């Protein structure tokens, strides 16, 4: 009995090692208050370039090993590396495409909404 | 009896190892609300480029190893565990349509995404 139990358990264990359990999901997030693309202004004597949200976030996360958490102003599946997160701007609808794990997508969304705040108009005389 | 069962079962297993069971489906999808290709606007003072869906998705999935799922806005698992980086999309302008190569599941997810992205645009009159 002992020998049957032991061998059956070990071989059922080995027949699963090739199975992968992690997965990737895609989040589509419209920007309500600002242009997705990088902005550039041409002036009589000057050229100015301003990076977009996608550019800034990518430039921040690039190369990160640790998972993210707590954005402020079996579980092995959970511990996806932050560097896997990818962001692509889609100006045609003024929206962001995000690829990664669900918690990552969540955090990114929170960060985006922390950032797309509408501007106050100023008149100068 | 035990020796013949052990032998036969093992030799059958090794005869089957070489059979390839994965299949590649082709889906054809028409766009209804937008042009398929990329568009460049040659403004009097500025050159501006807008990438098409095909480009943007092929850029998003680039080199991905894990499978796709849950998109939002015995052998079964072995087949399902198909890499994202194998999805291929070719824009066909002549009929304003996309050609998509992937597994049936991938094709389905891609289609759902497409239908999330070709929304019709509003008009604005400026005076």
């Amino acid at each position: 009995y002992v020998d049957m139990v032991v061998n059956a358990a070990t071989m059922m264990d080995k027949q699963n090692d090739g199975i992968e359990l992690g997965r990737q999901k895609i989040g589509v997030m419209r920007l309500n208050n600002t242009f997705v693309g990088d902005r550039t202004y041409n002036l009589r004597d000057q050229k100015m370039v301003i990076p977009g949200i996608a550019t800034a976030i990518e430039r921040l996360l690039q190369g990160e090993e640790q998972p993210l958490g707590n954005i402020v102003s079996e579980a092995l599946k959970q511990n996806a590396a932050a560097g896997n997160i990818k962001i692509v701007a889609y100006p045609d609808t003024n929206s962001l495409l995000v690829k990664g794990t669900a918690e990552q997508v969540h955090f990114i969304e929170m960060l985006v909404k922390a950032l797309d705040v509408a501007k106050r108009h100023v008149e100068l005389s | 009896y035990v020796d013949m069962v052990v032998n036969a079962a093992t030799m059958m297993d090794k005869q089957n190892d070489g059979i390839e069971l994965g299949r590649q489906k082709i889906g054809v999808m028409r766009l209804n609300n937008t042009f398929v290709g990329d568009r460049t606007y040659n403004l009097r003072d500025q050159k501006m480029v807008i990438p098409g869906i095909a480009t943007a998705i092929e850029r998003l999935l680039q080199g991905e190893e894990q499978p796709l799922g849950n998109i939002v806005s015995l052998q079964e698992a072995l087949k399902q565990n198909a890499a994202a980086g194998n999805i291929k999309i070719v824009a066909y302008p002549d009929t304003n349509s996309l050609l998509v190569k992937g597994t049936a599941e991938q094709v389905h997810f891609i289609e759902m995404l497409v239908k999330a992205l070709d929304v019709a645009k509003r008009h604005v009159e400026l005076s």
Binding site: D3, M4, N7, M11 | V6, A9, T10, D13
Partner: protein, 68 residues
């Protein structure tokens, strides 16, 4: 093996598998660099095993000869 008769994985498997993967694309540096160290570790293992088996047999031969 698929078989146990009632009464992890070794370097021999890992080498055969890395050779098998390499031979599909002999010019990829990641695969080459992954294979150099497996072929080296297999060479060292397979030498050290045989040398010690040889030592234990020469010990027993010397015992039998000493009591001849």
């Amino acid at each position: 093996s698929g078989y146990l008769d009632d009464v992890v994985d070794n370097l021999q498997t890992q080498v055969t598998e890395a050779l098998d993967k390499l031979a599909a694309k002999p010019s990829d540096p990641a695969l080459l660099a992954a294979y150099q160290s497996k072929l080296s570790e297999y060479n060292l293992y397979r030498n050290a095993q045989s040398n010690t088996v040889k030592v234990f047999k020469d010990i027993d031969a010397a015992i039998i000869q000493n009591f001849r």
